[PDB]
Amino acid sequence: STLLALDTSTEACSVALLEGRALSHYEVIPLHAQRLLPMVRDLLDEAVALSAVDAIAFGRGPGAFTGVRIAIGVVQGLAFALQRPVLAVSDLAILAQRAYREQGAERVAAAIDARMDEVYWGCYQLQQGEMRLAGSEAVLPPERVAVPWDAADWFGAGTGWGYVERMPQRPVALDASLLPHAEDLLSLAGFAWARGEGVEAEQALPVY
Amino acid sequence: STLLALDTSTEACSVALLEGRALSHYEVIPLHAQRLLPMVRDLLDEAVALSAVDAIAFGRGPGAFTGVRIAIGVVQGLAFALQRPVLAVSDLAILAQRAYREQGAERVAAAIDARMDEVYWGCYQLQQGEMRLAGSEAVLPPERVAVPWDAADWFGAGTGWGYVERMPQRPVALDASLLPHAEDLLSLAGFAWARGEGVEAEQALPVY
Amino acid sequence: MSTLLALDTSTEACSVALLHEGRALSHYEVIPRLHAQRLLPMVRDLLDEAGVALSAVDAIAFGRGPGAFTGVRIAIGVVQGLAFALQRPVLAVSDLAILAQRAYREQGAERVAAAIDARMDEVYWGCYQLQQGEMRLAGSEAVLPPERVAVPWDAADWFGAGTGWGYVERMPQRPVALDASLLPHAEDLLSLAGFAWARGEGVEAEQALPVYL
Amino acid sequence: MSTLLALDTSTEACSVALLHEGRALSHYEVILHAQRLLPMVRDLLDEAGVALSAVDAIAFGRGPGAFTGVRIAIGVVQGLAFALQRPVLAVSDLAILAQRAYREQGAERVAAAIDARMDEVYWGCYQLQQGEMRLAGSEAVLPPERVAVPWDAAADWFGAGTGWGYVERMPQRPVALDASLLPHAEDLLSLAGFAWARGEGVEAEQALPVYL
Amino acid sequence: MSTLLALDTSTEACSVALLHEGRALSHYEVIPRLHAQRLLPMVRDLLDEAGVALSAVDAIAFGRGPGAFTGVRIAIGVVQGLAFALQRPVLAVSDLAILAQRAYREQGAERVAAAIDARMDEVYWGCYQLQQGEMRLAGSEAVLPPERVAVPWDAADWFGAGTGWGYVERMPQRPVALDASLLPHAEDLLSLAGFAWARGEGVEAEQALPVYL
Amino acid sequence: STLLALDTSTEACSVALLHEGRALSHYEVIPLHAQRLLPMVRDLLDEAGVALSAVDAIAFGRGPGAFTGVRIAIGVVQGLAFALQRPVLAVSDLAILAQRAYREQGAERVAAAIDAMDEVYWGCYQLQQGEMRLAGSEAVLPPERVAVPWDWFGAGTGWGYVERMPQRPVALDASLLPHAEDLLSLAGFAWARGEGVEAEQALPV
Ligand code: NA
Ligand code: NA
Ligand code: NA
DSSP states (O other): OOEEEEEOSSSEEEEEEOOOOOEEEEEEOOOHHHHHHHHHHHHHHHOOOGGGOOEEEEEOOSSOHHHHHHHHHHHHHHHHHHTOOEEEEOHHHHHHHHHHHHHOOSEEEEEEEETTTEEEEEEEEEETTEEEESSOOEEEOGGGOOOSSOOOOOEEESGGGGGGGGSSOOOSEEETTOOOOHHHHHHHHHHHHHTTOOBOGGGOOOOO | OOEEEEEOSSSEEEEEEOOOOOEEEEEEOOOHHHHHHHHHHHHHHHOOOGGGOOEEEEEOOSSOHHHHHHHHHHHHHHHHHHTOOEEEEOHHHHHHHHHHHHHOOSEEEEEEEETTTEEEEEEEEEETTEEEESSOOEEEOGGGOOOSSOOOOOEEESGGGGGGGGSSOOOSEEETTOOOOHHHHHHHHHHHHHTTOOBOGGGOOOOO | OOOEEEEEOSSSEEEEEEEETTEEEEEEEEOSSOHHHHHHHHHHHHHHHHTOOGGGOOEEEEEOOSSOHHHHHHHHHHHHHHHHHHTOOEEEEOHHHHHHHHHHHHHOOSEEEEEEEOSTTOEEEEEEEEETTEEEEOSOOEEEOGGGOOOSOOOOOOEEESGGGGGGGGSSOOOSEEESSOOOOHHHHHHHHHHHHHTTOOBOGGGOOOOOO | OOOEEEEEOSSSEEEEEEEETTEEEEEEEEOOHHHHHHHHHHHHHHHHTOOGGGOOEEEEEOOSSOHHHHHHHHHHHHHHHHHHTOOEEEEOHHHHHHHHHHHHHOOSEEEEEEEETTTEEEEEEEEEETTEEEEOSOOEEEOGGGOOOSSOOOOOOEEESGGGGGGGGSSOOOSEEETTOOOOHHHHHHHHHHHHHTTOOBOGGGOOOOOO | OOOEEEEEOSSSEEEEEEEETTEEEEEEEEOSSOHHHHHHHHHHHHHHHHTOOGGGOOEEEEEOOSSOHHHHHHHHHHHHHHHHHHTOOEEEEOHHHHHHHHHHHHHOOSEEEEEEEOSTTOEEEEEEEEETTEEEEOSOOEEEOGGGOOOSOOOOOOEEESGGGGGGGGSSOOOSEEESSOOOOHHHHHHHHHHHHHTTOOBOGGGOOOOOO | OOEEEEEOSSSEEEEEEEETTEEEEEEEEOOOHHHHHHHHHHHHHHHHTOOGGGOOEEEEEOOSSOHHHHHHHHHHHHHHHHHHTOOEEEEOHHHHHHHHHHHHHOOSEEEEEEEOOOOEEEEEEEEETTEEEEOSOOEEEOGGGOOOOOOOEEESGGGGSOSSSSOOOSEEETTOOOOHHHHHHHHHHHHHTTOOBOGGGOOOO
16 A cells, blocks of 8 residues: 655654655754645655555644644645545654664653643553554653553653653663654554554544 | 635634635634534535635635644645645735625725734725735734824724724724634635736745 | 523632523532532522523523633533533633623723633733623733733723732733632623624534633 | 846845846745745756856845845855855845836836835835936935925826835825835846946945945 | 864854864854844954865854844855855754853853743743763753743753843742853854764755744 | 043933043033033043043943934044054943942842834843843833843833833833943943953944
8 A cells, every 4th residue: 555654743844655665754944834745745756646645644743733733734635635544643652663663662651842841751662563552642741750661671762851850760771862753654654554543634633 | 717715814714615606614713623624525515526626725824823824734735636726815915805895994904913912914905806915014012003094094804903092093993803704815816816826835835 | 582591610610690581590609620510400400490491591601711621621511411402502602701791790890801820820811891781802812921911901991800810910010900819600601692692603512612722 | 248146035025037148037936035045046047057156246135125034135145155256236126126117117217115114115216227227316214204206296207116005195106106016136137237337246245235 | 174164143142163174263253233244254254364265164054043033044144155155064053052062161061051032021942961072952942931941950950051041030940050141152053063063964055044933 | 441431322421531440420411422522531531630542441332322422422432442542342321321220329230221213222230249231132122012031220211111111110210321430330340351342343233
């Protein structure tokens, strides 16, 4: 199947696509309503028809309030006119999958920086090929943050780890600069698409 | 020509369409990423094919920072997949055209409420069939606001007129509750489309 | 003529009111967040005392917020349920507006800056001005730190209404007069609902929704 | 042979234009210029298949107009010009309007007005002299009530620019006017042609905005 | 080895610096907003004094903001122009970071909360922590009223750097030590640019852009 | 260090001198600066028994304030310094107000304001070791938008537009203008820190 993947939930702007081949475009600059569409076009041509796309995946957040919503609106529009379904994926999960692909982390406590001196928090454990949510995602002060494993070896991924000193527990290793990447969204979309998780364009929405 | 018109720049959510017939759907509720797409579908069917649409018009703002951007992203997506051009129209202008259609105002000082104790300000004068910007749009404190006519009879339209008491001049009549309406955007789009003002989906952007 | 039901649970106050044959009746109690426990019993008691059947109700007004997240949503649910089952319209009205209209009933203020305490050290804020009996909004409603707050008037006498005014010392302007204990009251929601019902502003139960600021 | 590159971002218009081997090319888009100006410059040199090394002078709109927009153009021009070791040609945006209005409507006497901040207009009057719109008097920033032409009460003249949205507060008005004209780099380039011919070019460091 | 040019005009300070053959040279002047008037002459003088050709420059670093709206954008323009004409990459670096790295050079602080005065009674804010020679950002940068400001540390010694700290009395935390006069300095931009150039973070001139917060 | 200080920023015209650690000042309100400044310099110089060649540096109010008066004091200063081959010290008029209001009314913190068309010049200063130092940044703003960085005084012509500030102060002087003696004070601080520059670079805000 051919799948398209967009993410504008952070500073990062990223798009990716899966005939059987898989390609990725990733640019860090804070604007998203400007560079998104071009990145789409650049990728479709340097690889493929748009009406050939079977489903579109997106970061649903959490992240930037406006950022996530720009991607949603684009995806909402693209998918409606194409009449194809969409694939809602968490940005904390994408971070999880990224820290897997990049550093081989099988247990990832993902944390993205939030407003009002808080962090978005989500813990992910590798099951089969995929990072999968352990418990639930939350918006917490860094001092209230907690993991669902015993402390085992686990990894901290994302900007929320700037607040590590204020947290009650720290992993062996961590990357405070990781951001959701469209490649990883695409991996996660594979699992979701194969499980028939797609939904109609309207139901594409950000998380609360 | 067949034209589609969306606006989510304020509390108001509105969509409109022009074969030769003209229809409008208008709902006031603060959410926009939920009700927009449905309103599109409801209108296309209760009147017409989506791939028959020749151009799409939108409120470019000013207004709600996120609100305008949701409409943009939708329009950006719709238009790209359809491969049709778009029609950028100011929300202050739509207010102008609304106050014309509704109360017969040929000179309209449009004012939309803005952040940080300011108003978005734009003055419009009826030329031929259309309200047209007199000077330029700005973001001002209400005490610095000014009109480009002599004080003649002119109208105040929009939420910025809550601050009327703080302004240095007041019109004969005003409506502090007017909001941009997709019908009026569609009128304004007629003039813009007939003048060949359309642009490629990417260039669809909010005003600063 | 019109029979209207009004419910509010947006703050510490739980209140309900009924317009029937030009007469208005109200029950108002302050509890903290036992609202789910007490909102229906109150509707029941009010209808019972008035001798009015629920089927007689033409529209249900509710406080739409802002205020407590769970509080507001309890009102929303009950109202949704009632109006869907009856197949009647609902009227959404702001709690800041309700504050404004109450300050006008109790203290005679015609120019009110309604403020409600909010989470995370902000306050909800909306300024209202009397027009033909109805306190109508001037500008927009917002959630702001009390420092960034501002009125749309110039020399004008105005009133500070609501528990947001507990932050008055942290706020730029102080009004001539103020009341920081004041809560939305369903009797005043009923007045505002009347004006809205006259303009036919009612919606279907599915659209009985809280505001986001 | 003189090759001239021309940039303008003084108003909501963003335009570039090139003069090479007696040919004039130009792009124009109405929409944050810092994102757009340089890409436009690239696309243009490409479309004409010319290299930046060939360019002999860089012309720019020196204002009046948007405070930051003018400065974005001045900054790019300064930077291009310094690295390239080329001179720069400062041209008024009121003049460019006048030159555009002449090209587009044959007006030989143009009162250019650009809407300015704080309820004023930028005002300058121009008249054709050997194919170049030349300033008659001074440029000013004025309330529209205090605006005046240097000509006798209607030969006819023309009102050009967004300052003309204030026509009703002005003490006189022309027979014809276009309150929607904006500077266009094609006209900047015509004007640049004249200034280059009189050796008006200056060092990159001196590319600066005007204050009125 | 690498020859790098660094320009900053984001605040009242106009500065420029050059890395050439391991040696670093700088010019720094405080003027108010005559930047367009003085930025190129400064580049010229610096190159002249160093005896370095502009063609020798491998990359141009710039302060990307936050700071003055027009100030920042003047730097952007000049840099865009220079790098496009030369066909060399640019390196965008935060002015809060520059502040942080300067406080580390001058006062030896390893934990800095950089704050810059901003329009409309807010301040720009970003907290930085030394890592292998480089002050690296901890969390995110923001524009906040000085009341809502907060650090990502616990017991830890930290430094307040920049003119945002003119609002220290209105701010929740006060650090052990502070400097509210401190401005971004191009010498320190040059250090940060080095780390970025080592990781190959350079972009094309068309992407030399200011930040939005 | 012998320091000469000049101000014509506003309507008031003033000059001051620091010789042999003694500080002397002449102040005169006159709406005429291109006419009375140099006489004042010569008179003050006579009265101190000092020759202009003695002077090590020249301080001046760089603005903001009346555009004409500022531009003349700047010009005079540049001329004096070029010819004597002496460094110059640019000091804000808002800082000068804040230093005056300290010296005169005891104010440990001041919010200086000077009327400009509609807007007013704004700057807030705090005392730090006898010197009124700037808090945030100086700004030009409309009276309503004006903020504060915090028992605090309000100084300058711009405090005549007091209503809807939004904040009103403890006490205030709306007719307070810059004074050379307080420019002198501030200059001594600047001098001692090596803040001098070339005549070429004396310039307004
Ligand atoms: Na609160
Ligand atoms: Na104007
Ligand atoms: Na500030």
